Design a protein around this ligand. Sequence first.
Ligand SMILES: Nc1nc2c(ncn2[C@@H]2O[C@H](COP(=O)(O)OP(=O)(O)NP(=O)(O)O)[C@@H](O)[C@H]2O)c(=O)[nH]1
Ligand SMILES: [Mg+2]
Length: 170
Amino acid sequence: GNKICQFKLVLLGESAVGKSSLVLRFVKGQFHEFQESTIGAAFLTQTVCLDDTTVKFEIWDTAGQERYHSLAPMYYRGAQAAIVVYDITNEESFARAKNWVKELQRQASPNIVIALSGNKADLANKRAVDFQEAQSYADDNSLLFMETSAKTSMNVNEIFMAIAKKLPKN
Ligand SMILES: Nc1nc2c(ncn2[C@@H]2O[C@H](COP(=O)(O)OP(=O)(O)NP(=O)(O)O)[C@@H](O)[C@H]2O)c(=O)[nH]1
Ligand SMILES: [Mg+2]
């Protein structure tokens, strides 16, 4: 089809949950076991086919370390969507994700679409966050939830595409 559109997506979450890995998997079909912690933010783009539309994702991959918290609004101001990422093996990272969700609900655009990624789902033998508990949390907060693995690719294209399908369209 011959339509085109573009939107801004921000990833937020505790350091080491796999934000950069998810973006690299989606954008480059790449996964690096040895990824350096991000400084401030990184920016990448992917263009995909969705139905009749060529959709360009402008992706802001934020640094999750607490020392960068005050920069976050620069990165989510203006975003049409967010993915808040946690690590399914780390309950504290899940708690931190909930606080990022609260911040977005209070301070981001009121029409932002927010997804929740329970990442590192390939490490389910070390699970700390019950799937159904996270799904219920997501449902109660109007969040798109998927468990993902940047390492295997599980649900990575799916979560990004599902967001793009739910961006307002008349
Ligand atoms: N097993 C597994 N490891 C993963 C997965 N996603 C990321 N990792 C690993 O987790 C580590 C941290 O990933 P990274 O993408 O740098 O995390 P981040 O959220 O961008 N960290 P920061 O916020 O500090 O930039 C890396 O060693 C990476 O290989 C995944 O789905 N499964
Ligand atoms: Mg990173």
